Amino acid sequence: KTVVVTTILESPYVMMKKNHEMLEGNERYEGYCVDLAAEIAKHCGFKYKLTIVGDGKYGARDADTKIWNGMVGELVYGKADIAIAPLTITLVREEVIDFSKPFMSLGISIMIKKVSPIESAEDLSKQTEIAYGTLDSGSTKEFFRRSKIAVFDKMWTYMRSAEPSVFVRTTAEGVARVRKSKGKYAYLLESTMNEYIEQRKPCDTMKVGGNLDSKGYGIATPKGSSLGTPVNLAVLKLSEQGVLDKLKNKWWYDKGECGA
Amino acid sequence: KTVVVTTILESPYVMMKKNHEMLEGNERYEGYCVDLAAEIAKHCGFKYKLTIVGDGKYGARDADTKIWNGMVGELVYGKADIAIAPLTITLVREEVIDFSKPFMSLGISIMIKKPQKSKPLTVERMVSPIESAEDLSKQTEIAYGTLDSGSTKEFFRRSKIAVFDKMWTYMRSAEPSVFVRTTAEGVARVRKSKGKYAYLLESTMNEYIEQRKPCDTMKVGGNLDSKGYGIATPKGSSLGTPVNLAVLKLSEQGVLDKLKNKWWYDKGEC
Amino acid sequence: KTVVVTTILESPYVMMKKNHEMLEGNERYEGYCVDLAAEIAKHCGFKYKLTIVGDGKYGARDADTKIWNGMVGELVYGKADIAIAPLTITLVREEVIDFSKPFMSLGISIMIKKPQKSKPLTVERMVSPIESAEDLSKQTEIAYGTLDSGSTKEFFRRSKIAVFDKMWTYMRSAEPSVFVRTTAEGVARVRKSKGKYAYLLESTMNEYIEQRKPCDTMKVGGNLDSKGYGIATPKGSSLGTPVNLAVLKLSEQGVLDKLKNKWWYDKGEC
Amino acid sequence: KTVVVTTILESPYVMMKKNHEMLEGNERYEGYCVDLAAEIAKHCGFKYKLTIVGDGKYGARDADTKIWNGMVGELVYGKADIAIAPLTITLVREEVIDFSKPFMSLGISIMIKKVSPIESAEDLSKQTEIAYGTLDSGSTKEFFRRSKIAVFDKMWTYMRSAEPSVFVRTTAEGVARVRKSKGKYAYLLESTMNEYIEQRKPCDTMKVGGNLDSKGYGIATPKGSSLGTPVNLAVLKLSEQGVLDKLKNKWWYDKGECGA
Ligand SMILES: NS(=O)(=O)c1cc2c(cc1Cl)N[C@H]([C@H]1C[C@H]3C=C[C@@H]1C3)NS2(=O)=O
Ligand SMILES: NS(=O)(=O)c1cc2c(cc1Cl)N[C@H]([C@H]1C[C@H]3C=C[C@@H]1C3)NS2(=O)=O
Ligand SMILES: NS(=O)(=O)c1cc2c(cc1Cl)N[C@H]([C@H]1C[C@H]3C=C[C@@H]1C3)NS2(=O)=O
Ligand SMILES: NS(=O)(=O)c1cc2c(cc1Cl)N[C@H]([C@H]1C[C@H]3C=C[C@@H]1C3)NS2(=O)=O
Ligand SMILES: N[C@@H](CCC(=O)O)C(=O)O
Ligand SMILES: N[C@@H](CCC(=O)O)C(=O)O
Numbered sequence A, D: 001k002t003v004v005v006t007t008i009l010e011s012p013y014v015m016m017k018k019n020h021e022m023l024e025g026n027e028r029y030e031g032y033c034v035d036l037a038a039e040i041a042k043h044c045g046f047k048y049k050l051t052i053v054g055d056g057k058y059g060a061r062d063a064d065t066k067i068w069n070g071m072v073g074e075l076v077y078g079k080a081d082i083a084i085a086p087l088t089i090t091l092v093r094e095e096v097i098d099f100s101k102p103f104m105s106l107g108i109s110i111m112i113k114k115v116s117p118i119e120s121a122e123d124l125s126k127q128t129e130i131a132y133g134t135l136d137s138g139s140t141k142e143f144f145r146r147s148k149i150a151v152f153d154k155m156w157t158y159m160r161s162a163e164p165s166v167f168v169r170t171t172a173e174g175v176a177r178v179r180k181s182k183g184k185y186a187y188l189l190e191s192t193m194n195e196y197i198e199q200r201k202p203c204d205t206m207k208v209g210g211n212l213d214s215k216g217y218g219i220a221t222p223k224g225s226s227l228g229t230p231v232n233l234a235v236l237k238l239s240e241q242g243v244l245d246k247l248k249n250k251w252w253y254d255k256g257e258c259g260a
Numbered sequence B, C: 001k002t003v004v005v006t007t008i009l010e011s012p013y014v015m016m017k018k019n020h021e022m023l024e025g026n027e028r029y030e031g032y033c034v035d036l037a038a039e040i041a042k043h044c045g046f047k048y049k050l051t052i053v054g055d056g057k058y059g060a061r062d063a064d065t066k067i068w069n070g071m072v073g074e075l076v077y078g079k080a081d082i083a084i085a086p087l088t089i090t091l092v093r094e095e096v097i098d099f100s101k102p103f104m105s106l107g108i109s110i111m112i113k114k115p116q117k118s119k120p121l122t123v124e125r126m127v128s129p130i131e132s133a134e135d136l137s138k139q140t141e142i143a144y145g146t147l148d149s150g151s152t153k154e155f156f157r158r159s160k161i162a163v164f165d166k167m168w169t170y171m172r173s174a175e176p177s178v179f180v181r182t183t184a185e186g187v188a189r190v191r192k193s194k195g196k197y198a199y200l201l202e203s204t205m206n207e208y209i210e211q212r213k214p215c216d217t218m219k220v221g222g223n224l225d226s227k228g229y230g231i232a233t234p235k236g237s238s239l240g241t242p243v244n245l246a247v248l249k250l251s252e253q254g255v256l257d258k259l260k261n262k263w264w265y266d267k268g269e270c
C-alpha cells in the first residue's frame, strides 16, 4: 500500500520547492523533515506520499470538547499514518499517540530584536514594559498553562490576560511581529527555530539567555500502529550513524546566510 | 510485590553516604538516581529496593558468545525489573530492552589534564594541546581511551565516520591498553598521566568531575554526538509505560531541572 | 461562623486587583495582608470575609469625646473580630485591644523628593538638604507633616524628647496644615511640593514607594524609633492566642520574610 | 512581698560590676537588663531581688523527658516570678510561659575573625572548609533543628553530625573559640551580642552577611501570672518613652572601646 504522511510547512523542516508549480509528488517538497521522511521510508521499505495538514496547527485540545486538531488530530482520527514534523514530545500527546525517540533536542527560547536588557526569563517576567507571546495550539502555550513554578505561572497569567491577544497564528507571523515591533515584542518559541531564524537574513533577531527547559521533537504514529517500533529503530539508527547530525548541519549551518 | 531497581555506582548519580556503615536499605545511597527512583515511586506507587549490579558494568555484547552482560544483561534475563541509572539509549540495547524517554541529555566529550597558565602584560591565558576530535586523532603524543563495555566504546566500534573510524582503529591496537574499567579509573589515569592521556566519557560526568575539587582536569572541544539517559525495562513489562509517563511528568514539572542543578552546581567549588 | 477580618487600603498590603469589577469575595484584593490572612486561616481554620473600613483610618481616640475611631475603634465596639493590617502596636491601643507578637518590623522615617544629581571629574553625586530629624527641626524652609489619626502622629504628640517635642510644636500650629488624611495624599504632596515638604511615614511603606516607579522620592537618615505591626483582636477574645501562635509559626517558618521579599523587593521597578 | 528575678550572666545585659566583693543585694549587679529590671520595678511598684539561674541555660527541653531547664525551667516550676534577660520569643517557649512584647529586635548572625570569603549563609553552608556552631540550649539551635528550608536543613545536619561537638557551653566560650581558631571557626549567635562583641577590644571579631531571620527578646513570666499585663505595659511605655533606646545606646555605643 501507500503511507500517507502529514506534516506542517515549517522551515527548514518542510519547504515548498522553488519550482513547485511545475512539480508533483514528493519532488515538490524539500527540507530536514522531507529528508527524514525519505530516509525513514528507505530504512522501513515503504512508499510514502507527503501531505500537509489542512490546518497549520501542530496539535492541542480544544475548548472543553476533547477534539484533537492539527497533526495529532490527523493521526488519532485515522486521516494519516505517520507524522514526520517538528512535533514536541509532551505528556498530553503521549497519552493519545506513541512518540519515537527524540531526533532533535531543544528548549524554550526567548527571541528579541537586535546591553541585553531582558537577559534571563526572570528579568523578562519581572518587567512589564516589553511584551511576549507564544504559538497557539503548540507545546509552548500548553507548557506555560500547565506550569506550576511561580515565575512561569505568573508569565502565563500575564499572557492569558493580554489586551490585545498576544498569541500568533504561525511562528512566521511571530517573527514578523517581533521584527516590526521596534524592540517592544518578544517571541517565545523553540530554540531550533530561533537559531534558524537568527542565522538567516536580515539577522535582525537574536536569542537571549538560556533554554527554560529541555524537550525534543518526535515522530508520531497512531496509537497501537505497526510502524511504531520500525520508525523508532530507524530514528535510533539514523542518530547512531550521524545522519541526523549531518542533516541538521546541512539545513541549519551549511548555508549560513549571515555574518557570524 | 516490591520492585528490584538495579543501579550502578557513579557520581553524582549514586554515592554511598558517610554514615552507611550502620545505615541499611534505601537510605544507604545518596545522589541523583536515588532521588529519581524516589520520584518514580511517588508517581506510580511501589516499594523499591535499590541494588547494585555485581559486574559493575553498564552492559555490552561479549565476543562470539552472544551473551548480554552488565546492567542491561542482568535486566534482560529477569533478575531485575527496572534500571534507574545513567544508562545510554542505543540501537543495540533497544532491540533487547524497552527504553523510556530520556531524562537527561548527554554527549561524548574529551577529558584532559588541565594545563598551567602560560604567562607571556601580566595576563594569564589557557592554552591546550587538543582542541577537537580531529586533531586528537591526527596527533600521537597524547593517548586516548574509552570505558570498557560502555556506550562510547560501542559507538566508536560501529562508527563509519572517517575520523571516528581512525580513532577506533588506533584504540583497537593500542599497546598497552587505553581502555579502562571504571570512570574513576580513567579520571585517575588522566590525573596521574601528566597530560599524556585523554579520557572519552559523557559530558555530564565530565562536568561533574571538572566542577569538584581538586579540579585539575578540563573538557575540551564540543560534544562528539548527542544522546540521552533513559530508564530501562525488559521487553513487554507492565512497568515500561508507567515509568515513561513518570519521566515525562517529571520533565514537565521541572523536578529534573532542580535535581540536576542541586546535584551538579550547588555542590561545586573552585 | 464566618469571621470578619477588617483591613485598611494600603499598598502593598491590600490593593484591589485589576479585574476586580467582576470579582467578589476574597479575590478583589491582592498584596501582603490578604495572603497573611489566608495563612492565618490555614493555620487556625475559619472562614474569613475581608472588609475595608468605612472611614479609612488606622485608629485614634479623639480627646474630650473618648470615642475610638478607625480600625481600632471599630474593633473595640464589636463590629469586627480581627484586624489583619499594618496596625502599629502602641501603649494606648494595648489598653483597649489585645495585640499579637509583631509580624513586621518598622520605624518612623522621612520621605523627601529626590534631588537632581550634582554635576561635578565627571562623577554624579547625590546631595540632600536634610539627613536627620534634628536638622529637620532646626530648619524652616521645608515643611514636615504626618498622617492624621495614625501611630506616628500620636507618637510625636506624646513625645517628651526635646527634638521630637520641637517637631510636634511646629506641627500642631502650622498654617496651612501639614497633616494628611491618606498615605498616598502625603506622597503626592511630597512629589508635587518640589522639595519643600518632607513626609513622616513608616519605613516599610517608604521603602515600597522608593522601589517603585516613578521613584522620584528617597528616604533620609535612619528610623526615629523601633516599632512593629501586630494583628489586633478585641479585649478578652478567643481568637487572640491562636492568632499569636499562628504569627509565631509563620515567623519561624520563613513565610513572613518570603512574603515581604516577594511583595517588596521582587517587583522593584527602579 | 518580694519578687525573685532570674537572669543570666550575659554582657552587656547583666554584669557583675568590678568591686562586687564588698557589695550585696541588687547593688552588686549592673547592665542593660539590670536597668530594665529597675525601670520595671519602678513602673509596677514592687521590690525585687536579682538572682542568677544556677546553670547558665536560657531554656530548652531535655532528651525526651519534657523537663524545662534554665530560666524557662526556673519559671514553669515556680522557682522564679519573672525573667528579665535576653530570652528569645519562640513558638515552643510561648506555649509554656507568658512573653511580653519584644524590647529588643534582633536576628541570627555570623561572626568570624577579622573581604570575607563566606559573607552570606549560602556560601558558609556550601563551603565545608569553614566550621560553624551555635549555643547549646538556646534558640538558634532550636531554630536550625526545627527549620524546613533546604539550606538551614543542610547546616543543621552538618552541625549535629560534627566531630568533635561544635556546640559551645557559653557564648563567651564561643567568642574565645572563634578568636583562637585563627579564622577557622564561625559562630552563629544573636545579632546584638555579635555587635557588642565586635565593638569591644581587641576588635578581632567581625560580623558578615545579613540576618538569617528576625526575632526579639521578651520578658517571661509564669503562665497565668498577675504580672504579665503590668510588665507588658511597662515594656510598651519604656519603648514609647525612648528608655529602651537610651539604655541600648548607653550599654552598646556610648563606651565603644574600638577603632571606628
Ligand atoms: N544535535 S541534534 O539536536 O540534531 C540531535 C539530538 C538528538 C539526537 C540526535 C541529534 Cl543529531 N538523538 C537522541 C536519541 C538517540 C538516542 C539517545 C537519545 C535519543 C535516543 N535524541 S536527541 O538527544 O534529541
Ligand atoms: N537539562 S537535562 O540534561 O537535565 C534534561 C534533558 C532532557 C529532559 C529534561 C532535562 Cl532536565 N527531557 C527530555 C524528554 C522530554 C520530552 C521530550 C524529550 C524527552 C521526552 N529528554 S532530554 O532532552 O534528554
Ligand atoms: N523581616 S520582617 O520585617 O518581614 C519580620 C519581622 C518580625 C518577625 C519576622 C519577620 Cl520576617 N518576627 C518577630 C516576632 C517573632 C518572635 C520574636 C519577636 C516577635 C515574636 N517580630 S518582628 O521582629 O516584627
Ligand atoms: N532598637 S532596639 O533593638 O533596642 C528596640 C526594638 C524594639 C523595641 C524597642 C527597641 Cl529600643 N520595641 C518594640 C515593641 C514596642 C511596641 C511595638 C513593637 C513591640 C511592641 N519591639 S522591637 O521592634 O523588637
Ligand atoms: N513544534 C511545537 C510547536 C512550536 C511552538 O510551540 O513554539 C509543537 O509541536 O508543539
Ligand atoms: N553512560 C554509558 C556508560 C559510560 C561510558 O560508556 O563512558 C552507558 O550507559 O552506556
Ligand SMILES: N[C@@H](CCC(=O)O)C(=O)O
Pocket: C058, C059, C086, C087, C088, C147, C149, C150, C151, C152, C153, C200, C201, C202
Ligand atoms: N501603621 C500606622 C499608620 C501609618 C502612619 O501613621 O504613618 C498605624 O497603625 O497607626
Ligand SMILES: N[C@@H](CCC(=O)O)C(=O)O
Pocket: D058, D059, D086, D087, D088, D135, D137, D138, D139, D140, D141, D188, D189, D190
Ligand atoms: N539568647 C538566646 C540564646 C542565644 C542563642 O541561641 O544564640 C535565647 O534566649 O534563647
